[PDB]
Amino acid sequence: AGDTTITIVGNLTADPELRFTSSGAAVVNFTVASTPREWKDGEALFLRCNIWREAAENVAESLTRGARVIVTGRLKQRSKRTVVEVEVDEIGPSLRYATAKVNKA
Amino acid sequence: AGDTTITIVGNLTADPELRFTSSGAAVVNFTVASTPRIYDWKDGEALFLRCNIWREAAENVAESLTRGARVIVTGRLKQRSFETVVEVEVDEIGPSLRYATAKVNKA
Amino acid sequence: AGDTTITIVGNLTADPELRFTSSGAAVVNFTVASTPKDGEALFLRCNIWREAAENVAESLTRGARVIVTGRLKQRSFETRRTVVEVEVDEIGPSLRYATAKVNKA
Amino acid sequence: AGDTTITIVGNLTADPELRFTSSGAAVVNFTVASTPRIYDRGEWKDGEALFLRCNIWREAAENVAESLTRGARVIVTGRLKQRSFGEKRTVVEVEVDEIGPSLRYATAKVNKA
């Protein structure tokens, strides 16, 4: 029934925006700034991603603005206007230019 | 220096419209209607992704595909300026033989 | 859990191997030759079943350029090992260098 | 011209193994244990574990060695290569492009360079 999956590597434009909903389900919305083609150049891409629950909490606690992340999910369309968003499936900080102490839970 | 590659499986919303550009390069723009099936089964809302395929690959698509067609599309996400949108820079495309057959003609 | 999905583009090394089971279920096994002209060819084995399998067998032939999606799987030939295969989910002929007449079912 | 990029999510089977080469250029080899969760009747079912060998080079390799440990849940992107390991057997590996720790079950203190 058709589907989509995407992987992107980019930087958070700002610190993780935490909130909750009527359930008590943790929601974070953040944008990844990715610029294609380090040599040459592209035209910056801004993708909005949404991550939910446990994962959302951990994201908020761990990542900050400018952070270089690796994101996976599907594409989703927002609502007379449409916008493409990412239903984050997994996300983590790229260890290409950084280190991290990891804490299991 | 991030980057972003995507793969989608959908149906063309309409026959491929072939066009061109200042250089000569054939250009085809089309939309893929993809409807993800969720956990609960449930068929969540339809997605409409615009895809651009250029040069020869574009020509072949225009010749081969028609509306309704179930396709398999790979590429990268790109933004065009508003005042914006997300589009696919198709890298490869082809008709999913999940519900059909095809007579393939190399060049 | 874990994401083991993959998409690949290559050519079929040979005409697809149709075949059947006690059930009467169709199984095709074929190999995709992909070269990452920086290279060194990669040979992935792919298995596709039922209806889709039948369609492939009828449509595709050796040398064919295809677009394949599925998950990596690991199979047994464990002597003195394990091999990686693709559980094809969707497959089509890449229109990059060819045309095709579609005919839905 | 072929496309062999892949993304996987799994857990390191063991602590990252750092080593170098003729150059002094760093190299890490590790394995990711991924187990897909297959659906039939329905009801979840796991399914046979996959073990993919990944190689990551240079500064990224150093960072990995310093940050990650065995059991760690990672997100790896890269390309599949074939090498030559019945006498000369062949084995599919990942040329890691980008890697990081999945924040799905954990937090991390990130520190740039």
Strand D27-34 relative to strand D17-19, pairing: antiparallel
Pairing of strands D43-44, D50-57: unpaired
Nearest to C11 by CA among D3, B73, B89, B64: D3
For residue B54, list its beta bridge partners: B27
Q: Report the number of distinct structural domains present in chain B.
A: 1
Q: Mutation test of the interface with chain C: which of A5, A54, A70, A71, choosing the one with the most C Cβ atoms within 10 A?
A: A5
The coordinates were experimentally obtained by X-ray
Q: Which among C61, C92, C99 has the least Cβ separation from residue B97?
A: C92
| Resolution, angstroms, 1 dp | 2.8
Can you tell me the distance from the alpha carbon of B17 to that of C33, in angstroms, rounded to the nearest whole number? 32
Hey, are the CB atoms on D6 and C6 less than 8 Å from each other?
yes
- Per the structure, the complete domain to which residue A83 belongs is given by 1-105
Q: Extract long-range pairs of A11-20: CB within 8 Å, 24+ residues apart.
A: A11/A66, A11/A67, A11/A68, A11/A69, A11/B2, A12/A63, A12/A64, A12/A65, A12/A66, A12/A67, A12/A69, A13/A46, A13/A65, A14/A65, A15/A63, A15/A64, A15/A65, A16/A59, A16/A60, A16/A63, A16/A64, A18/A56, A18/A57, A18/A60
Nearest-CA distance from C80 to chain B in Å? 38
Strand, coil or helix: D64: helix
Phi then psi for residue D68, to 5 deg, are: -95, 160
- How many whole angstroms separate alpha carbon D12 and alpha carbon B12? 41
Cα distance between residue B91 and residue B93, in whole Å: 7
Query: Which residues, in sequence order, are CB contacts of B81 under 8 Å at separation 6+?
Result: none
- Count Cβ atoms below 10 Å from residue C62 Cβ, excluding itself: 11
Q: Contact C65/C30 with Cβ under 8 angstroms?
A: no
DSSP character string of D23-49: TS--EEEEEEEE----EE--EE-----
Say how far apart CA B29 and CA D11 lie, in whole Å. 41
SS (H, E, C) chain A: CCEEEEEEEEEECCCCEEEECCCCCEEEEEEEEECCCCCCCCCCEEEEEEEEHHHHHHHHHHCCCCCEEEEEEEEEEECCCCEEEEEEEEEEECCCCEEEEEEEC
Cross-chain Cβ contact B86/A82 below 8 Å: no
According to DSSP H, which parts of D1-113 are helical?
58-67
Nearest CA in chain D to B2: D98
Q: Searching chain C, which residue's CA lies closest to the CA of residue D92?
A: C84
Q: Is B60 exposed, middle or buried (0-12, 13-18, 19+ CB in 10 A)?
A: buried
Considering only CB atoms, A61 lies closest to which of D64, D75, D107, namely D107
Residue position matching structure tokens 């599309």: B73
Contacts of D41 in chain B (CB under 8 A): none
Give me the residues paired with residue C67 across strands. C9, C92
Residue indicated by tokens 């419209």:
B17
Chain C residue numbers with beta carbons less than 8 Å from the beta carbon of D50 are 2, 4, 72-74, 84
CATH number at residue A104: 2.40.50.140
**Cα–Cα dist C96/B14, whole Å:** 20
Place of tokens 């550009």: B21
Q: How far apart are CA B76 and CA A36, in angstroms?
A: 9
Quote the Cα angle for D40-D45-D47, to 5°: 110
Q: Which residue is associated with the tokens 């298995």? A: C47
